[PDB]
């Protein structure tokens, strides 16, 4: 059980700027309401992507992946490239070993994904016309779509599972679950309404935007030192940090890129 939280944004513009915006090509009332939606969505990904980082259990092995993450080197063939692909596949089975699920997605940093792609076996479009839905780097030989991050400052690799069997049984790491029902909305995909004020001192209007969502970890992820408990709040990341099953993170150690 987790209570939702709130995200709010406000920009504000002057009528003078809006007046010349129309004379300069754009549609200020329509363009401005687009900017917040892009901003809010761009922040939500920074929440969801960086929530998997603070939830997914680290996958370590004694031989190489000890000390937290695997280090790769450019030398000697795709040998380094295919080594990561091996660590990707083992993470899939480890999910199926404990979370019994199929691990139908994979997320990694932009630089981290290229070496995963450099191993071959990364055909751009899938052989089967599945969901694809763009927004993916490749699709891997394992059939797992690969998603590029470009945001998280980690150089990591994350494998997780998203499944909706049907009816009410929807299961997957990080549940999101926005909260807007009961509120008068147009096009219910909006997730939150706008608001205009126009302050009295000046008269330039401002626009606000409110969004609420749950963003809780999946079950079977009880916090350590709690173990036996049946009211576990799956929202507080501090308790779920590392104590998850349906997602396994793996960083990558690479030489720094000169600037």
């Amino acid at each position: 059980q987790t209570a939702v939280k709130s995200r709010k944004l406000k920009t504000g513009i002057t009528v003078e700027l809006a007046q010349d915006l129309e004379a300069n090509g754009f549609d200020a009332p329509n363009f401005l309401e687009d900017l917040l939606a892009t901003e809010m969505a761009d922040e939500i990904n920074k929440d969801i992507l960086q929530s998997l980082i603070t939830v997914s259990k680290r996958y370590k092995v004694t031989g190489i992946t000890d000390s937290g993450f695997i280090d790769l080197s450019y030398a000697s063939a795709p040998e380094a490239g295919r080594s990561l692909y091996r660590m990707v596949c083992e993470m899939v089975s480890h999910i199926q070993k404990e979370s019994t699920y199929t691990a139908t997605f994979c997320v990694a940093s932009a630089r981290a994904a290229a070496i995963l792609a450099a191993s071959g076996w990364l055909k751009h479009k899938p052989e089967d016309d599945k969901y694809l839905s763009q927004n993916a780097y490749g699709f891997l030989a394992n059939g797992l779509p690969l998603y590029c991050d470009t945001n998280s400052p980690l150089d990591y690799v994350i494998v997780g599972v998203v499944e909706n069997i049907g009816e009410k049984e929807i299961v997957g790491s990080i549940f999101y679950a926005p909260y807007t029902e009961g509120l008068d909305l147009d096009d219910p995909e909006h997730v939150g309404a706008f608001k205009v004020v126009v302050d009295p001192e000046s008269l330039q209007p401002s626009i606000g935007l409110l969004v609420r969502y749950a963003l809780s970890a999946n079950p079977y992820t009880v916090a350590k030192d709690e173990k036996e408990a049946r009211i576990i709040d799956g929202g507080d990341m501090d308790k779920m940090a590392g104590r998850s099953d349906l997602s396994v993170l793996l960083g990558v150690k690479l030489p720094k890129i000169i600037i």
């Binding site: 709130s6 995200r7 709010k8 944004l9 920009t11 922040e43 920074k46 980082i53 501090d238």
Partner: protein, 104 residues
């Protein structure tokens, strides 16, 4: 800065005005943090999970050593959603959205 470039979140529990009071990470301030208390670096704000981080991590570089802690569960990114009471107290610094157009 460009939204996609940073990765930090300003609308939420972090806020923007709140970032002023958040302690800046230094080479000296590393050996002071505890459980709870936040810390920011390159406008990205994290909270510390396990007491006295950057102690088992002997990496000399500051930026890399911070990245080590992320994997080792020692610290955690504080990109998070604000609690409902934050925007209804009549004293609420709400995050701002800004834009700029340059012509080539």
């Amino acid at each position: 800065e460009f939204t996609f470039k940073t990765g930090a979140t300003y609308a939420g529990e972090a806020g923007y005005v709140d970032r002023e009071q958040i302690t800046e990470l230094t080479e000296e301030s590393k050996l002071t943090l505890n459980k709870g208390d936040l810390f920011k670096y390159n406008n990205i704000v994290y909270k510390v999970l396990e007491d006295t981080p950057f102690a088992t991590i002997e990496e000399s570089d500051l930026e890399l050593a911070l990245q080590i802690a992320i994997v080792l569960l020692k610290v955690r990114l504080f990109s998070d959603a604000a609690s409902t009471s934050k925007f209804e107290s009549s004293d609420s610094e709400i995050a701002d959205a800004r834009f700029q157009i340059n012509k080539w």
